[PDB]
């Protein structure tokens, strides 16, 4: 060992590339990509120097970073001699999304200029097709640099014949970014969603694909617009099921007998991201608290859960184990010694543990809620807790929906909610400012085309303020370019901001519009809090339908809830042109709104319902 061997360092990566030491370059580069991973795209704790002019100019400092990184990556991967260790390949595909961002936030856009150096057939006959030598090594390198923004052609069928596993690693990488919003990237991912599932279903386990981003593959499909977007989850479940049987020798429990604690049957709840300042606790703690009239509750989670989270349950334990095989054995053992009636996950999708767990048989009733609002397509999960007013069509879900009364999941209000108001109802707007509260995953070309439509068509000048949740570090310059490609001067791409500052941006707006197809929830509450009204578009999936449910609970009029893009655009424009209508409605909403009603209700049903379903299991 040497001191400072493992510090991500842009100058040391560059020097290793100039010195043609391909091994040190790779490893120095992987250190940087790994850090970008940990930092969620931020560049803190990566060492680099910059021209003084950039000191206070952070976006410009980030673009400078990505530019240095893309030039050094270009030299390195353009060199015909470079050969990547097969360990190395697996790491590069796992970090692909970070290279994607390196290039997309630089002026290069993508790494096609590297790709073109790999062409061998001076014919072409389409210069967007790249004909490689037959070296396995060249196929690899191509894949690593086949970015979501790539313009080069890709034929998946031929690909998957040559190497199934390489090709499934690509599909993973290309599904894993938290921003897939441009036309080029989105279209690519859409293709994968139709093509990849039936191919992944043929896979045997997780050994030679990038498994550390399966949770990302699992969640991100929800942000596409197709009806059958979740098919990849069904496939992914089978491979995980095969994995845990084959690599772990997993055995399901005998769930014919249940045990008892303080004379009640046992609900074991496996938790993801359940801190009391966060939305899972805000939406699901009270229903879990009330479930204690009928069940003893055991909470399994991470040390990230705070005292208020732990107090929801009768008993709380850390999920122990050094790997997945162990954590599962641990979870199994808790269910065994207690003899679980219920296995429940309020959220599934954010951590890989919950995903694995949902492919096992641990209790006779196994059920989830929609903290991540999408069907599991797992045959091991029977029920889905959901508020009746949030369901669109029941056929979006493979599981049976347990539709609970619309006041059955009262929310815990945020401690950050301002106590005082200051409504700004602008009588004279030259400009209509229209806010949009969003994460990067919610952004897409259909949403942004709808927004360009509202801008082009409205007879009033409009300005769009995007308050982008978690837009950040090297992701952000790329997002701003995407937004500007549609709206130019009619839009401001605000990066992630603290709560009071985020509230200040919206407070300067006249109305809001909601993203589709995956809408807001918390955005809507902040909207009404500020006395604002907006448009949302509804649809069949819960994540499309929530906004409708929520608009009705809060007392917003149905004309605000559009069924199609063309209506969405239409109502948005109407809200923007019709000043006095818009203001009357703001005044109506300031005056009488169900904000109150979100925080109260009867949380008992969930427990009640699990009891009946359990009692009926105990007769048979």
Where does this chain touch ligand UDP (CB under 6 A) — which range of 316-324, 454-462, 478-486, 521-529?
Answer: 521-529
Interface pick for ligand UDP out of 279, 302, 529, 597 (rule CB under 6 A): 279
Nearer to ligand UDP, 231 or 526 (CB): 526
By CB under 6 A, tell whether 492 contacts ligand UDP.
Answer: no
By CB under 6 A, tell whether 285 contacts ligand UDP.
Answer: no
Nearer to ligand UDP, 310 or 522 (CB): 522
Distance CA 567, CA 575 (A): 12
Residue pair 487/510 in contact (Cβ under 8 Å)? The answer is no
Residue pair 206/239 in contact (Cβ under 8 Å)? The answer is yes
Centre a 10 Å sphere on the Cβ of residue 193 and count the other Cβ atoms it contains: 21
By CB under 6 A, tell whether 502 contacts ligand UDP.
Answer: yes
Interface pick for ligand UDP out of 526, 544, 547, 548 (rule CB under 6 A): 526
By CB under 6 A, tell whether 521 contacts ligand UDP.
Answer: yes
Nearer to ligand UDP, 255 or 280 (CB): 280
3-state secondary structure of 511: strand
Contacts (Cβ under 8 Å, ≥6 apart) of 485: 182
Q: Provide, rounded to whole angstroms, the least separation between the CB of residue 373 and ligand UDP.
A: 9
Residue pair 210/168 in contact (Cβ under 8 Å)? The answer is no
- Residue closest to 173 by CA, chosen among 140, 204, 133, 213: 213
- Residue closest to 64 by CA, chosen among 55, 39, 16, 479: 55
Where does this chain touch ligand UDP (CB under 6 A) — which range of 20-28, 450-458, 477-485, 516-524?
Answer: 516-524
Interface pick for ligand UDP out of 346, 364, 469, 534 (rule CB under 6 A): 469
By CB under 6 A, tell whether 523 contacts ligand UDP.
Answer: yes
Q: Provide, rounded to whole angstroms, the least separation between the CB of residue 526 and ligand UDP.
A: 5
| Element of type H or E holding 192 | helix 183-200
Where does this chain touch ligand UDP (CB under 6 A) — which range of 89-97, 119-127, 518-526, 603-611?
Answer: 518-526
Q: Provide, rounded to whole angstroms, the least separation between the CB of residue 290 and ligand UDP.
A: 22
Where does this chain touch ligand UDP (CB under 6 A) — which range of 145-153, 186-194, 428-436, 494-502?
Answer: 494-502
- Residue closest to 572 by CA, chosen among 587, 584, 582: 582
On the question of a cis peptide bond just before residue 517, with omega within 30 degrees of 0, the verdict is yes
By CB under 6 A, tell whether 40 contacts ligand UDP.
Answer: no
By CB under 6 A, tell whether 530 contacts ligand UDP.
Answer: no
Nearest residue to ligand UDP by CB is 522
| Element of type H or E holding 36 | helix 22-38
> E-strand spans in 287-353?
296-301, 315-318, 342-345
Interface pick for ligand UDP out of 39, 163, 497, 593 (rule CB under 6 A): 497
Q: Provide, rounded to whole angstroms, the least separation between the CB of residue 497 and ligand UDP.
A: 4
Q: Provide, rounded to whole angstroms, the least separation between the CB of residue 390 and ligand UDP.
A: 12
Centre a 10 Å sphere on the Cβ of residue 81 and count the other Cβ atoms it contains: 6
3-state secondary structure of 433: strand
Nearer to ligand UDP, 523 or 534 (CB): 523
Interface pick for ligand UDP out of 184, 522, 593, 597 (rule CB under 6 A): 522
Nearer to ligand UDP, 110 or 444 (CB): 444
Distance CA 120, CA 109 (A): 24
Q: Which contacts (CB < 8 Å, 24+ apart) does range 114-123 have?
A: 114/73, 114/74, 114/77, 114/78, 114/145, 115/142, 115/145, 115/146, 115/150, 115/152, 116/152, 117/78, 118/142
By CB under 6 A, tell whether 514 contacts ligand UDP.
Answer: no
By CB under 6 A, tell whether 499 contacts ligand UDP.
Answer: yes
40: left (phi over 0), alpha (psi -120 to 50) or beta: left
Interface pick for ligand UDP out of 35, 375, 439, 475 (rule CB under 6 A): 439
Residue pair 288/310 in contact (Cβ under 8 Å)? The answer is no
Q: Provide, rounded to whole angstroms, the least separation between the CB of residue 547 and ligand UDP.
A: 10
Token duo for residue 485: 């490609």
By CB under 6 A, tell whether 607 contacts ligand UDP.
Answer: no
Nearer to ligand UDP, 106 or 433 (CB): 433
- The runs of H, that is alpha helices, within 403-521 are 445-457, 476-487, 499-507
Contact code string over 231-270 relative to ligand UDP, x by CB under 6 A = ----------------------------------------
Q: How many helices (H) and strands (E) does the chain have?
A: 25, 13
By CB under 6 A, tell whether 312 contacts ligand UDP.
Answer: no
By CB under 6 A, tell whether 467 contacts ligand UDP.
Answer: yes
By CB under 6 A, tell whether 372 contacts ligand UDP.
Answer: no
By CB under 6 A, tell whether 276 contacts ligand UDP.
Answer: no
Interface pick for ligand UDP out of 520, 606, 613, 614 (rule CB under 6 A): 520
Centre a 10 Å sphere on the Cβ of residue 202 and count the other Cβ atoms it contains: 12
By CB under 6 A, tell whether 515 contacts ligand UDP.
Answer: no
Distance CA 262, CA 295 (A): 9
- Which residues of this chain interact with ligand UDP, rule CB under 6 A? 279, 439, 467, 469, 496-497, 499, 502, 520-523, 526
């Amino acid at each position: 060992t040497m001191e400072n061997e493992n510090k991500p360092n842009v100058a040391n990566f560059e020097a290793a590339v100039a010195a043609k030491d391909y091994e040190k370059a790779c490893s120095e580069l992987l250190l940087i990509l790994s850090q970008l991973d940990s930092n969620f795209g931020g560049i803190q704790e990566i060492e680099f120097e910059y021209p003084a002019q950039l000191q206070d100019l952070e976006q410009e400092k980030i673009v400078y970073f990505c530019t240095r990184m893309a030039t050094a990556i270009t030299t390195l991967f353009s060199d015909p001699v470079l050969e990547i260790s097969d360990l190395g390949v697996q790491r590069f595909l796992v970090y692909q999304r970070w290279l994607a961002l390196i290039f997309a936030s630089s002026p290069f856009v993508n790494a096609d200029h590297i790709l073109q150096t790999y062409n061998r057939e001076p014919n072409r006959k389409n210069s967007l097709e790249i004909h490689l030598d037959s070296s396995k090594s060249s196929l690899i390198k191509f894949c690593i640099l086949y970015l979501p923004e790539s313009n080069v052609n890709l034929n998946l069928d031929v690909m998957w014949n040559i190497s199934p596993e390489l090709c499934a690693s690509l599909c993973f990488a290309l599904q894993s970014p938290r921003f897939i919003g441009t036309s080029t990237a989105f279209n690519k991912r859409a293709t994968i969603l139709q093509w990849f599932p039936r191919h992944l279903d043929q896979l045997k386990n997780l050994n030679n694909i990038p498994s550390a981003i399966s949770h990302d593959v699992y969640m991100h499909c929800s942000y596409d617009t197709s009806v059958n977007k979740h098919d990849v989850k069904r496939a992914l479940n089978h491979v995980i099921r095969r994995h845990i049987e084959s690599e772990y020798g997993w055995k399901d429990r005998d769930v014919a007998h249940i045990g008892y604690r303080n004379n009640k049957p046992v609900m074991v709840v496996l938790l993801e991201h359940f801190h009391s300042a966060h939305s899972i606790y805000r939406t699901h703690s009270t229903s879990m608290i009330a479930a204690r009239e009928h069940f003893y509750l055991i909470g399994l989670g991470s040390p990230s859960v705070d005292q208020a989270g732990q107090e929801v349950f009768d008993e709380f334990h850390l999920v122990a184990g050094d790997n997945m095989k162990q954590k599962l054995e641990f979870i199994r053992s808790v269910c065994e010694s207690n003899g679980a009636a219920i296995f429940y996950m309020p959220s599934i999708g954010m951590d890989m543990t919950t995903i694995f767990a949902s492919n096992t048989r641990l209790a006779p009733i196994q059920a989830i809620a929609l903290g991540h609002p999408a069907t599991t397509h797992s045959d091991f999960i029977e029920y889905v807790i959901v508020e009746d007013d949030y369901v669109g069509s029941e056929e979006c879900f493979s599981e049976t929906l347990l539709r609970l009364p619309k006041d059955a999941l009262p929310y815990v209000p945020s401690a950050l909610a301002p106590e005082k108001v200051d409504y700004l109802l602008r009588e004279n707007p030259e400009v209509v400012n229209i806010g949009i509260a969003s994460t990067t995953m919610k952004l897409n070309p259909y949403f942004l085309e709808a927004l360009k439509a509202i801008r082009d068509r409205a007879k009033v000048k409009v300005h769009f303020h995007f308050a982008l949740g978690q837009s950040n570090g090297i992701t952000h310059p790329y997002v701003e370019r995407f937004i500007k490609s549609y709206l130019g001067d009619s839009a401001t791409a605000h990066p992630h901001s603290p709560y009071h500052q985020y509230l200040r941006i919206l407070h300067n707006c006249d109305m809001m519009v909601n993203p589709f197809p995956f809408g807001n929830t918390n955005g809507i509450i902040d909207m009404v809090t500020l006395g604002l009204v907006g448009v949302c578009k509804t649809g069949a999936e819960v994540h499309e339908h929530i906004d409708e449910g929520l608009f009705k609970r809060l007392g917003l009029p149905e004309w605000l809830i559009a069924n199609t893009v063309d209506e969405y655009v239409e109502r948005a424009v109407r809200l923007a042109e019709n000043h006095q209508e818009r203001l009357e409605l703001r005044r109506y909403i300031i005056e009488n709104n169900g904000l109150n009603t979100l925080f109260t209700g009867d949380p008992r049903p969930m427990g009640q319902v699990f009891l009946e379903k359990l009692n009926a299991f105990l007769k048979e």
